[PDB]
Amino acid sequence: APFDKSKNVAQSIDQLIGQTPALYLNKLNNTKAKVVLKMECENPMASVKDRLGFAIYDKAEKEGKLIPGKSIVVESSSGNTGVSLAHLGAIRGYKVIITMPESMSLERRCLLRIFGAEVILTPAALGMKGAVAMAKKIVAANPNAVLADQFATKYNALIHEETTGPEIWEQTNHNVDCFIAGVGTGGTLTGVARALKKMGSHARIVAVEPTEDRSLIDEVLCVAGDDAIETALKLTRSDGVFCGFSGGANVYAALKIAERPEMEGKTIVTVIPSFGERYLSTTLYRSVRDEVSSLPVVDASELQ
Amino acid sequence: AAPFDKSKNVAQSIDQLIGQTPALYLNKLNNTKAKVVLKMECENPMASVKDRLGFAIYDKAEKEGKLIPGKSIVVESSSGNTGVSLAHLGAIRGYKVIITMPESMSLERRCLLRIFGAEVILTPAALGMKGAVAMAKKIVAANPNAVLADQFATKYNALIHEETTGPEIWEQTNHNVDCFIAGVGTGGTLTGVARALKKMGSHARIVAVEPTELDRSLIDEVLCVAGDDAIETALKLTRSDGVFCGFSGGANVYAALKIAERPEMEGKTIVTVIPSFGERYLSTTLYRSVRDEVSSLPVVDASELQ
Ligand SMILES: [Cl-]
Ligand SMILES: [Cl-]
Ligand SMILES: [Cl-]
């Protein structure tokens, strides 16, 4: 059986990665279809990328390609893959180096540095291309250093075929008519689609392309940034799901699909990749920040 | 009970994901001969143990007929994790939630509450908590459908931890708890977990953690933890064990490590609590040492990449 974390004591926090909950969308869903959210936001470092981090360390160690205390893990990511690599690197005793443009927030730097990752900042003008350049440069310069990106490419779809997809299959009672996720790198889409196919599911596979190459994909749905953003704010207030831009896009897509006549009574599954708190000080929740920042204050004369 | 198998079913409400939190052994940071178990309340859906209290408030108050969905207005004079949980769970249940809070409380706290659609009302800094309380009172005095939530926090806090948190620890440790450690001050697991253990016939030592720099028979020992020790421990914990928490968790872990070095604790099991996830505190003084470090980092010159 997968580790029963609700009933036993874990030996390591990596045993808490995956086996995430699944949640019906209720108040926001005014259709005759069912929408299931795979709550990857509930991972220990608050995103789906914990699965990828674990896969990188676990599979690369098993191949003999990462050695704790010798290998230096180098990654040119600001986002959650870098966070997970830093997190799990710390506990497994790897030096982790993250390159990122200087333009990324202090918060993002801070998240990485709390785990003891070495944060290297690159010129704002060169953007992410410059961070990649720096990472490639650090690795060429040290034979013990490895680019983590090669492992992400090798293992990402596999970990989701092995874990996320089977979990969805069991949670939904072997009943999936449509699976929706982002076209991005480092997500569930390919691996979960493969798992569903292999289980004999006839689920329709929908890739979400945000407006702000596989034989597995049945349909690409383009979602405007402003719809993703608006959906994320509605989600918190309707169903208590607090996520990032990707999750809002996915839910928008799911609701659109759910309005189709042929989807009446069917089960649509989508993914909430990351918890929203990481994004509180970003553009996604700017509307809320701007609002509370200029509230009136009750006069002391009214408080007696 | 029929306890919800969330790794294996689809939940009808996010309330069902509250509780049934993991427990984790401290490894690299534990250099003692005792076992230290962390009850990971940071893994609740809104990232703190107070989700259990928010749930208890709505669940129990509704059963008492004191909260009526679609009619009651929930009025809460606090902006901490209990306030967050009330706003979060109120939204999904269809309640308007009002938070009264001093203007001096952090902008980030205001933002998180407003994310859930709470009405955030600010009161003068000079009047502090008492002005927020007076403002809550004023609202409720003018509308009989408005209800002060703090009465319910008082009534149900210890009870929900007796009913859920405590029994979960008991099961997770396979009925083997030699010591339970948690913070003083309301909102805590301490009283309710201690009561659960004692009902189960456990004679675990109960240690209250008191930060510096019933509420009698239940406590065997008080352990004073300096704020600096709590802070340093929180940052060590992230690097050693990958546990990312707030001040309270750092203090608890510091305390647990002190109990673990007691000779009579050799081979014993000590349980403590990680109340909340650390991300909420990244903009606070708890992680200021790290913010100051990363804010002064050098930037690689474009020459090096060309
Ligand atoms: Cl995804
Ligand atoms: Cl997201
Ligand atoms: Cl904490």
Numbering used by the authors:
A (entry chain A): 22 to 233, 260 to 351
B (entry chain B): 21 to 233, 259 to 351
Sentences reproduced from the published study:
The de novo pathway of cysteine biosynthesis requires the conversion of O-acetyl-l-serine into l-cysteine, which is catalysed by cysteine synthase (CS). As CS is not found in humans, it constitutes a potential drug target. Crystal structures of the three enzymes were determined at resolutions of 1.80 Å for TcCS, 1.75 Å for LiCS and 2.75 Å for TthCS. These three homodimeric structures show the same overall fold and demonstrate that the active-site geometry is conserved, supporting a common reaction mechanism.
Each LiCS monomer adopts a compact structure composed of nine α-helices and 12 β-sheets with an extended C-terminal tail. The C-terminal tail of each chain is formed by a flexible region that stretches across to the partner subunit of each dimer, forming an extensive interface. Further analysis of the homodimer with PISA shows that LiCS has a large dimer interface involving 27.0% of chain A residues and 26.6% of chain B residues. The active site of LiCS is found at the centre of each subunit between α1 and α5. Although the purified protein was yellow in colour, suggesting the presence of the cofactor PLP, no electron density for the cofactor was observed. It is likely that the PLP was lost during crystallization. As no PLP was identified at the active-site lysine of LiCS, this conformation corresponds to the apo form of the enzyme. The structure of LiCS was resolved in the open apo form, showing key changes when PLP is not bound to the active site, specifically the absence of a loop covering the active site. In comparison, under the conditions of the assay LiCS produces significantly higher concentrations of cysteine than TcCS and TthCS, reaching 2 mM cysteine before plateauing at 5 mM OAS.
